[PDB]
Design an enzyme around this catalytic site. Structure first.
Site, PDB file in Angstrom:
ATOM      1  N   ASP A 169       0.831  -1.217   0.000  1.00 37.53           N
ATOM      2  CA  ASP A 169       0.000   0.000   0.000  1.00 37.53           C
ATOM      3  C   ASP A 169       0.862   1.262   0.000  1.00 37.53           C
ATOM      4  O   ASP A 169       0.593   2.219   0.722  1.00 37.53           O
ATOM      5  CB  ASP A 169      -0.980   0.007   1.179  1.00 37.53           C
ATOM      6  CG  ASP A 169      -2.041   1.159   1.100  1.00 37.53           C
ATOM      7  OD1 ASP A 169      -2.171   1.811   0.021  1.00 37.53           O
ATOM      8  OD2 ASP A 169      -2.724   1.427   2.140  1.00 37.53           O
ATOM      9  N   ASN A 219      -3.256   1.596  12.918  1.00 39.83           N
ATOM     10  CA  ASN A 219      -4.208   0.497  12.827  1.00 39.83           C
ATOM     11  C   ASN A 219      -3.541  -0.833  12.473  1.00 39.83           C
ATOM     12  O   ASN A 219      -3.950  -1.882  12.981  1.00 39.83           O
ATOM     13  CB  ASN A 219      -5.291   0.818  11.806  1.00 39.83           C
ATOM     14  CG  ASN A 219      -6.427  -0.173  11.856  1.00 39.83           C
ATOM     15  OD1 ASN A 219      -7.069  -0.349  12.894  1.00 39.83           O
ATOM     16  ND2 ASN A 219      -6.656  -0.863  10.741  1.00 39.83           N
ATOM     17  N   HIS A 220      -2.528  -0.814  11.608  1.00 46.20           N
ATOM     18  CA  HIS A 220      -1.960  -2.032  11.038  1.00 46.20           C
ATOM     19  C   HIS A 220      -0.474  -1.839  10.767  1.00 46.20           C
ATOM     20  O   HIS A 220       0.017  -0.713  10.677  1.00 46.20           O
ATOM     21  CB  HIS A 220      -2.646  -2.374   9.733  1.00 46.20           C
ATOM     22  CG  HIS A 220      -2.823  -1.184   8.857  1.00 46.20           C
ATOM     23  ND1 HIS A 220      -3.964  -0.412   8.876  1.00 46.20           N
ATOM     24  CD2 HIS A 220      -1.972  -0.584   7.990  1.00 46.20           C
ATOM     25  CE1 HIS A 220      -3.817   0.597   8.037  1.00 46.20           C
ATOM     26  NE2 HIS A 220      -2.619   0.514   7.484  1.00 46.20           N
ATOM     27  N   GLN A 249      -1.469  -6.107   5.245  1.00 45.49           N
ATOM     28  CA  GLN A 249      -1.511  -5.103   6.304  1.00 45.49           C
ATOM     29  C   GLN A 249      -2.421  -5.595   7.424  1.00 45.49           C
ATOM     30  O   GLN A 249      -3.532  -5.084   7.575  1.00 45.49           O
ATOM     31  CB  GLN A 249      -2.013  -3.761   5.766  1.00 45.49           C
ATOM     32  CG  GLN A 249      -1.274  -3.228   4.536  1.00 45.49           C
ATOM     33  CD  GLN A 249      -2.065  -2.120   3.811  1.00 45.49           C
ATOM     34  OE1 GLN A 249      -2.955  -2.397   3.006  1.00 45.49           O
ATOM     35  NE2 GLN A 249      -1.756  -0.864   4.128  1.00 45.49           N
ATOM     36  N   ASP A 309      -3.227   7.882  10.909  1.00 46.99           N
ATOM     37  CA  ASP A 309      -3.872   7.279   9.754  1.00 46.99           C
ATOM     38  C   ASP A 309      -4.979   6.351  10.215  1.00 46.99           C
ATOM     39  O   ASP A 309      -4.843   5.663  11.228  1.00 46.99           O
ATOM     40  CB  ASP A 309      -2.842   6.524   8.910  1.00 46.99           C
ATOM     41  CG  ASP A 309      -3.477   5.597   7.888  1.00 46.99           C
ATOM     42  OD1 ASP A 309      -4.053   6.068   6.886  1.00 46.99           O
ATOM     43  OD2 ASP A 309      -3.388   4.374   8.082  1.00 46.99           O
ATOM     44  N   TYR A 328     -10.797   2.814  12.903  1.00 48.84           N
ATOM     45  CA  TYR A 328     -10.863   1.368  12.780  1.00 48.84           C
ATOM     46  C   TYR A 328     -10.008   0.641  13.820  1.00 48.84           C
ATOM     47  O   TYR A 328      -9.769  -0.564  13.677  1.00 48.84           O
ATOM     48  CB  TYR A 328     -10.476   0.976  11.345  1.00 48.84           C
ATOM     49  CG  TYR A 328     -11.213   1.826  10.301  1.00 48.84           C
ATOM     50  CD1 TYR A 328     -12.545   1.594   9.971  1.00 48.84           C
ATOM     51  CD2 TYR A 328     -10.565   2.876   9.663  1.00 48.84           C
ATOM     52  CE1 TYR A 328     -13.200   2.397   9.010  1.00 48.84           C
ATOM     53  CE2 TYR A 328     -11.192   3.659   8.733  1.00 48.84           C
ATOM     54  CZ  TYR A 328     -12.509   3.435   8.405  1.00 48.84           C
ATOM     55  OH  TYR A 328     -13.101   4.286   7.472  1.00 48.84           O
ATOM     56  N   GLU A 375     -12.193  -3.446  17.376  1.00 40.38           N
ATOM     57  CA  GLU A 375     -13.291  -4.225  16.798  1.00 40.38           C
ATOM     58  C   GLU A 375     -14.147  -4.862  17.887  1.00 40.38           C
ATOM     59  O   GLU A 375     -13.621  -5.377  18.883  1.00 40.38           O
ATOM     60  CB  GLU A 375     -12.772  -5.331  15.879  1.00 40.38           C
ATOM     61  CG  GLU A 375     -12.163  -4.845  14.582  1.00 40.38           C
ATOM     62  CD  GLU A 375     -10.720  -4.451  14.746  1.00 40.38           C
ATOM     63  OE1 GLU A 375     -10.027  -5.034  15.613  1.00 40.38           O
ATOM     64  OE2 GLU A 375     -10.269  -3.567  13.988  1.00 40.38           O
ATOM     65  N   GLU A 414      -6.986  11.473  10.510  1.00 41.85           N
ATOM     66  CA  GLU A 414      -7.716  11.072   9.315  1.00 41.85           C
ATOM     67  C   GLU A 414      -8.967  10.343   9.778  1.00 41.85           C
ATOM     68  O   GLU A 414      -8.865   9.273  10.380  1.00 41.85           O
ATOM     69  CB  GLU A 414      -6.858  10.158   8.429  1.00 41.85           C
ATOM     70  CG  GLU A 414      -7.513   9.735   7.087  1.00 41.85           C
ATOM     71  CD  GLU A 414      -7.003   8.377   6.499  1.00 41.85           C
ATOM     72  OE1 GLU A 414      -6.622   7.467   7.249  1.00 41.85           O
ATOM     73  OE2 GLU A 414      -7.026   8.210   5.265  1.00 41.85           O
ATOM     74  N   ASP A 433      -5.207  10.039  -2.031  1.00 46.61           N
ATOM     75  CA  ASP A 433      -6.150   8.952  -2.234  1.00 46.61           C
ATOM     76  C   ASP A 433      -7.168   9.336  -3.305  1.00 46.61           C
ATOM     77  O   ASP A 433      -7.162  10.446  -3.848  1.00 46.61           O
ATOM     78  CB  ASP A 433      -6.872   8.593  -0.933  1.00 46.61           C
ATOM     79  CG  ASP A 433      -5.964   7.904   0.081  1.00 46.61           C
ATOM     80  OD1 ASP A 433      -5.187   6.995  -0.318  1.00 46.61           O
ATOM     81  OD2 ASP A 433      -6.041   8.257   1.288  1.00 46.61           O
TER      82      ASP A 433
HETATM   83 CA   LIG Z   1      -8.167  -2.440  13.832  1.00 42.26          CA
END
Ligand SMILES: [Ca+2]
Ligand SMILES: [Ca+2]
Ligand SMILES: [Mg+2]
Ligand SMILES: [Mg+2]
Lengths: 548, 548
Positions: free
Chosen positions: A58, A100-101, A172, A204, A208, A211, A246, A314
């Site tokens: 990415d 996040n990742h 990712q 970034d 998210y 979960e 973001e 993006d």
């Molecule tokens: Ca996550």
């Protein structure tokens, strides 16, 4: 007022800005050598796209080391020279923090996929950095951001024989933010760059983080609690630094990423809500959606500032519009199928606007006039185009066009050898669109942009003022006031492609004398009931002040 | 009405426009290949620059022959196939009939300089084709046109032991129209060409072809008489063919070149008086001198049509303005001494206006919206620049920039090998400024120019209507009606670089609504005393209609 509230931001990618060693890839010495350009433009804060070791699946948002500089970009010393040179000219620099990742090559994931028990039977402390399921059935019904690539947010790892969670590419995997160890790993990664003098981070993909079964797994309160702790850490250990979020969410969710006066979270949040509407209005010649979506945005806390933008690295995201608005945007701005990607349109600003400088100028003035600090997508300031033959969103990341020479001055490597190929077509290529040309051209878009930031810079009401829409009686004419510390600005914009009339309701300002901010040409004093007639030419913009 | 009143005129030079063979010289076969581009642009009539054999000491206006094709431009064959194609698409072609003088290398001077009698005793019929003078005192009270180059209009020849007359260069001996065998030879000049398909001529330097003592030797009644013959000769023998005259004089003295209803002179005459006050009013942001010079034109005959222009193959003449106005003009439009020449300024239109497209578009509107038939000077439709490292006025005569290849597509010869060098500079050069690019760019100045031609052609009151200026209460805002056949145009133009308010005087139209010519968006209905309020943004043009 905090420095980010008065800053003009500029988004660039190191790998794509200036090549300094002939290999075709941008690097930190090439960027350094161009800091004069950024400073003389009016830019105050550089936001750099990720610069870490990464296979680039990415494009570097798949971090394989949160504490290095990626070999394409130079050394950790090159980064230290760049950060010192940028500060000597009065620029701030922020980095890009992928919370996040990580990349599936991150040493953490290479250790985690080895199972809960490392082959000698003791517990594998890293297995828990990531998010695992026996059959990938949890969190069903949650949506897939990369709709054109992934079919599930779960994927089966061949060596662990379990599934792992990823909100983005399969390369990712999501980090596990219920594991206190993961929280400290990143606070510690933030600490390593903040200790070196970085002025803050764009953060970034923040919605998210956490979960939960039975939820959408966006905007979860646990996610906010983590982000609160990032700010509480920055607030204690690094007063003055900037955290910028973001979060492409609807208005009632975006505003939450500021937190509250008592529980601060982010200092700044991109105004994703307004951005699609700027483009819709223009095409409908009806600005009500701009006013409607703005009016859904709550007041933000005292430290807070929006960051306004027209386009970034993006695609133009239609994730947060209605089904009908989305469909309307695809028909108006994506006439070819190859133009779209994952609920978005992957085009540069200038081609979105048919290269019509008048429309470019209009939106660029709306960008500078709303509450917030603006961010410029590198190259948009000379009218750069796109290369939609490239995959994913790479088409809007072609190299910066410095001059009409070899590969637009980006590199002395041939175009086919650059990381992404520099645009060469007759409309948007570097022979016609380049920085050298436009510095010598007296009326270039570059000089306009600079002049227009110079204009903005001279009126703090643009950066700190309130905001009050004004009835115009013509949906084509958007009008608002910006008020701060005495001065009142009145900003009038026509979104139609021909001449239009309106009746501005300046009843609160009867007896005031509007003047242009550029040169103070006088307009009729507001009298009577204050219903004030105006005419405007196609895409005109009036920057006025109301004198009492 | 006659075809000339309703036509779009395009000025070009065959040598400069398109090379067909490869020798860096534009030839007729090459022009013939670019006829579609002129057709699609919306041009009706090509006015060519002298195509006749010459030494080119003044790019073809030192004519050595009146009845052949300069070998640079190709053959008479080629000319036929050219005029056959221009006509096979609906294009009129007029020519440059150079009258007051020839090239010193023209047989009739070569023969005439041998003296008043041949060595054998028989009177030299040719010696009195040209004006002679024993001691060069005849005609003092006169100005020299080319004051940078010529000290006096008399030039002592050697072989004829005599002075001879030239209003321009010493290599352009003036012609004697107190001789009637001269007059015949220039009626016979014409006959040659109009007999092949030509549609008319621009007539060079009309006001100077009769000289007499005690006067100014311009605009003399003796001079207008011959012209009347040419018109008479043409009406009688070639009906429906055009006569257009270069008459750079103060207005009333120019109007005289039209004739009267009784005895008629020129159909068409360049509106030199107004062309400079456009430039003046833009810099002054005060249109008052645009009215004044139109308000000092006398009404003109029925058949009569002004030719409107902004720039042409010469400099921007400043010959016919006050000495106050000529100083301001230099101060505003010639910052560098070498930009002036012969009481003028030798810059192209886009550089004259700072390459600012808004200003360019504005003068173009006012061009196409003033009473006349407009002429566009080639390359201005793309924004070409000027090269001051060429001598005389050849700096605004560079090769047509067609695309971005070898020499701008103008020739396969390299730039060092072209009759004049194409322009290569970062701003105006052909890598940035060319036709291919502007064909492909939705919002290019080329497409804007042909869109505005389409829009002029849907409203015949531009070509044929009368003209009434409207009060605006602000000198920066110029407004006027153009009525014809029960349609009224309201043309409103702002010459200021910032926004301007006006109070338009629309009393005669109470109960009418202005509607945009483009897109048909109506404005509010004129009411009350018809004091209709307006606001305009920098360099706006409003092209309106007033409905009953
Ligand atoms: Ca996550
Ligand atoms: Ca003469
Ligand atoms: Mg490199
Ligand atoms: Mg040739």
């Amino acid at each position: 007022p905090e420095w980010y509230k008065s800053a003009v931001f500029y988004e660039l990618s190191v790998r794509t800005f200036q090549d300094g060693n002939g290999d075709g890839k941008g690097d930190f010495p090439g960027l350094t050598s161009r800091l004069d350009y950024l400073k003389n433009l009016g830019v105050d804060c550089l936001w750099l796209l990720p610069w870490f070791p990464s296979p680039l699946r990415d494009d570097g948002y798949d971090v394989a080391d949160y504490r290095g500089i990626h070999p394409d970009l130079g050394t950790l010393d090159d980064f230290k020279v760049f950060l010192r040179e940028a500060h000597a000219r009065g620029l701030w620099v922020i980095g890009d923090l992928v919370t996040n990742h990580t990349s599936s090559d991150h040493p953490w994931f290479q250790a985690a996929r080895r199972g809960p028990t490392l082959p000698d039977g003791s517990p594998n402390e890293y297995h828990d950095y990531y998010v695992w399921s026996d059959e990938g059935k949890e969190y069903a019904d949650t949506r897939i951001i990369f709709t054109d690539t992934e079919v599930s947010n779960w994927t089966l790892d061949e060596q662990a024989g379990k599934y792992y969670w990823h909100r983005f590419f399969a390369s990712q995997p999501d980090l596990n933010y219920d594991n206190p160890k993961v929280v400290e790993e990143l606070h510690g990664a933030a600490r390593f760059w903040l200790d070196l003098g970085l002025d803050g981070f764009r953060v970034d993909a923040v919605p998210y983080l956490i979960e939960r079964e039975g939820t959408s797994c966006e905007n979860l309160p646990e996610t906010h609690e983590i982000l609160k702790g990032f700010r509480a850490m920055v607030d204690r250990e690094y007063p003055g630094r900037l955290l910028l979020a973001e979060a492409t969410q609807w208005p009632e969710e975006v505003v939450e990423y500021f937190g509250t006066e008592a529980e601060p979270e982010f200092h700044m949040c991109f105004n994703f809500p307004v951005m699609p509407r700027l483009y819709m209005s223009l095409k409908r010649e009806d600005t009500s959606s701009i006013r409607e979506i703005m009016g859904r945005l709550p007041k933000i806390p005292s430290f807070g500032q929006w960051c306004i933008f027209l386009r970034n690295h993006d695609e133009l995201t239609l994730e947060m519009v209605t089904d009908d608005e989305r469909a309307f945007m695809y028909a108006a701005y994506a006439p070819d199928a190859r133009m779209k990607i994952n609920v978005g349109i992957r085009r540069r600003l200038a081609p979105l606007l048919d290269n019509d400088r008048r429309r470019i100028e209009l939106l660029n003035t709306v960008l500078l006039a709303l509450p917030g600090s603006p961010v410029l997508y590198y190259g948009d300031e000379i009218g750069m185009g796109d290369d939609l033959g490239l995959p994913d969103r790479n088409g809007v990341r072609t190299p910066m066009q410095w001059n009409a020479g070899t590969s637009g001055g980006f590199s002395t490597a041939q175009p086919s050898d650059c990381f992404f190929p520099p645009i060469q077509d007759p409309v948007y290529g570097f022979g016609r669109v380049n920085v050298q040309s436009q510095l010598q051209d007296p009326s270039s878009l570059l000089k306009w942009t600079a002049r227009q930031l110079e204009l903005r810079r001279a009126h703090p009401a643009f950066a700190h003022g309130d905001l009050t829409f004004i009835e115009t009686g013509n949906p084509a004419i958007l009008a608002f006031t910006r008020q701060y510390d005495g001065e009142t600005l009145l900003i009038v914009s026509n979104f139609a492609g021909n001449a239009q009339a309106g009746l501005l309701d300046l009843a609160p300002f009867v007896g005031r004398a509007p003047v242009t901010l550029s040169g103070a040409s006088p307009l009729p004093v507001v009298t009577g009931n204050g219903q004030y007639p105006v005419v405007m030419g196609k895409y005109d913009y009036y920057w006025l002040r109301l004198n009492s």
